[PDB]
């Protein structure tokens, strides 16, 4: 228990003298063990940048400056049209799809409910499952109805 208390008392004084600024102590096994940072967050970089270069109210100071000093960044902004699409299709529960998918007298309803159920089933599918389902859809439609498809 040597250098541990002397290391900890510096952080215990930082919270009062200089709130909001933390300076960890390294290059000492007894001092680094006091506040073990997570290994995922323990990254060592030897960059020349420092945390004391920041200044309070830097936005006001930068704004109140001549425009000559500042330089361009070589970027361009262009207009773009937004997406107005609302929630277009009405949703129904999984159980509600099931009963319409197994209805017998679909001919009298012109297969409207069956088509709606198929469409909502396609909606729940992902990019690949929907595409494969569509390919099977067309394959089984063409195979069973040559008079309508094979023209």
């Amino acid at each position: 228990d040597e250098t541990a208390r002397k290391a900890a008392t510096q952080l215990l004084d930082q919270i009062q003298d200089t709130p909001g600024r933390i300076s960890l102590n390294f290059e000492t096994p007894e001092a680094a063990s006091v506040c073990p940072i997570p290994t995922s967050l323990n990254q060592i970089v030897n960059t020349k940048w420092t945390v004391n270069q920041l200044q309070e109210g830097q936005l006001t100071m930068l704004l109140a400056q001549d425009a000559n000093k500042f330089k361009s960044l070589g970027v361009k902004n262009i207009k773009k049209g937004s997406v107005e699409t609302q929630i277009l299709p009405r949703q129904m529960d999984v159980k509600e799809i099931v009963e319409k998918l197994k209805k017998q007298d679909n001919d009298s309803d012109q297969f409207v409910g069956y088509a709606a159920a198929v469409a909502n089933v396609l909606r729940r599918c992902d990019a690949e499952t929907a595409q494969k389902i569509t390919q099977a859809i067309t394959a089984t439609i063409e195979k069973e109805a040559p008079s309508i498809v094979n023209c």
């Binding site: 919270i15 909001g20 960890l24 960059t47 940048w49 945390v51 970027v75």
Partner: protein
């Protein structure tokens, strides 16, 4: 006279009489005016004395015996001041904890509390809104620095909406921290525009790139609304309730807590006119917005034109913290998603603090407030806004009522971006609106649309977008 000297020195520093300071504190704490009472009593020596009684937060407060009504009122106001000031009510600064344990976030909590208390010395009126706090820390190597600080746990009312974007939509603490981080990034961009060596950015391919070793950390005083922060003893039920633990949740205006989607009213998008006459406005919960920030970045859509996406490194919650639940709320439910490049899912670290005590906690059972405050490193000064309208209020000539847009409003960000582009000699199309300006970022818009579509496909829920009328104002 049993009055601590710190009340007197704060009154002297404020430059106003104790009556004025007490009235201002009461106005900020509640939504009404103080109620006063007086008593007249005789004395054995034939003198007359007055006693003053006031009501603060529903608690009766009686002042000391004084020879004048004004003196008794001053004594009662001083007693109310001492009651409402947490400097002596609970403690000044604890400044003591146990070391040698993996509680690095305790240091951040203590530092942000100390910063909040230090800001409470320049302005003695911003006391009392420490129920919920949030802050952002900048980390380079072994050094930490706070850049953001804000409070608030309520939202904008449905009857105070406006189409010109001068009213804040969400006043919770976490969102204001990100809004201030946006201003900090703007200031850093300006610093890079003149001093690339002194800035955190570098001239990389495909716009600016953050320098290596620089990371951002977010701390939250309490568990965010939504999936997390569950305190019901009924316990989870069947599999349907288990599925509800990951469903999207929305806020309710003029209400409390969060509601579960799938009701008979969540269909169809919200409308400006409908909300104006009393329709409930739906706002995404804190955990939901944390998931959006983790997936698509915290810089937003407007700033995506200049800098690469930036993601948080660690999230810490002091009270009602669950390591398993917090990870599921923000990381697990969207880990399988694969956003297009350069966007990616960030495995944010989940951290917990050391101290927690429900009996002395100030989470929910304490008194509620209507105003919220925010502080920013780039601005260097604190700002106080009213949640009911999201607008800054001030007084002049000892009267009247002035309404001022907040610095974090959409219009202020639009003017800041316009100045950003004009000072950088980068031409922008004119005229342009807020909605069109955000849509300019092709990569960010496509990523957001893909994320929304993936959320819809996986039956997690429906994202309630705000009406278009909120962003149709023209930017000049």
């Amino acid at each position: 006279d049993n009055i601590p000297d710190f009340v007197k020195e704060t009154v002297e520093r404020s430059g106003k009489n104790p009556m004025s300071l007490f009235s201002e504190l009461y106005v900020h704490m509640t939504g009404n005016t103080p109620v006063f009472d007086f008593y007249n009593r005789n004395q054995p020596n034939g003198s007359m004395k007055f006693i003053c009684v006031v009501i603060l937060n529903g608690e009766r407060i009686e002042g000391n015996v004084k020879s004048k009504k004004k003196e008794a009122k001053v004594s009662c106001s001083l007693k109310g001041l001492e009651v409402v000031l947490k400097h002596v009510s609970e403690y000044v600064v604890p400044a003591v904890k146990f070391e040698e344990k993996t509680t690095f976030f305790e240091m951040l909590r203590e530092h942000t509390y100390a910063k909040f208390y230090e800001l409470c010395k320049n302005n003695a009126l911003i006391y009392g809104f420490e129920k919920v706090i949030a802050s952002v820390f900048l980390k380079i190597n072994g050094n930490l620095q706070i850049i953001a600080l804000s409070t608030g746990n309520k939202g904008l009312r449905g009857d105070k909406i406006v189409n010109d974007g001068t009213a804040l939509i969400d006043c919770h603490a976490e969102i204001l921290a990100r809004r201030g981080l946006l201003r900090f990034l703007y200031s850093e961009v300006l610093k890079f525009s003149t001093e690339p060596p002194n800035s955190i950015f570098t001239k990389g391919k495909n716009a600016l790139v953050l320098k290596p070793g620089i990371s951002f950390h977010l701390f939250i005083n309490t568990a965010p609304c939504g999936v997390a922060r569950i305190d019901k003893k009924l316990k989870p039920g069947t599999s349907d309730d288990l599925q509800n633990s990951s469903r999207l949740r929305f806020k309710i205006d003029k209400g409390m807590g969060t509601v579960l989607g799938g009701a008979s009213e969540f269909e169809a998008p919200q409308t400006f006119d409908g909300i104006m006459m009393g329709e409930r406005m739906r706002t995404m919960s804190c955990s939901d917005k944390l998931l959006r920030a983790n997936v698509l970045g915290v810089q937003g859509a407007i700033l995506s034109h200049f800098i690469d996406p930036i993601y948080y490194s660690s999230i810490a919650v002091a009270e009602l913290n669950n390591a398993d639940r917090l990870r599921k709320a923000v990381y697990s439910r969207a880990a399988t998603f694969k956003p297009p490049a350069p966007f990616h899912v960030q495995d944010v670290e989940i951290g917990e603090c050391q101290v927690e005590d429900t009996e002395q906690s100030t989470s929910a059972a304490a008194r509620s407030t209507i105003s919220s405050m925010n502080w920013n490193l780039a601005d260097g000064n604190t700002e106080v806004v009213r949640t009911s309208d999201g607008m800054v209020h001030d007084k002049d000539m000892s009267g009247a009522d002035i309404t001022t847009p907040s610095r974090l409003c959409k219009k202020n960000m639009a003017e800041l971006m316009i100045t950003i582009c004009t000072l950088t000699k980068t031409s922008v199309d004119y005229p342009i609106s807020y909605e069109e300006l955000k849509a300019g970022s092709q990569e960010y818009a496509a990523a957001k649309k893909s994320f929304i579509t993936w959320l819809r496909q996986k039956d997690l829920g429906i994202w309630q977008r705000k009406p278009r009328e909120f962003q149709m104002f023209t930017i000049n």
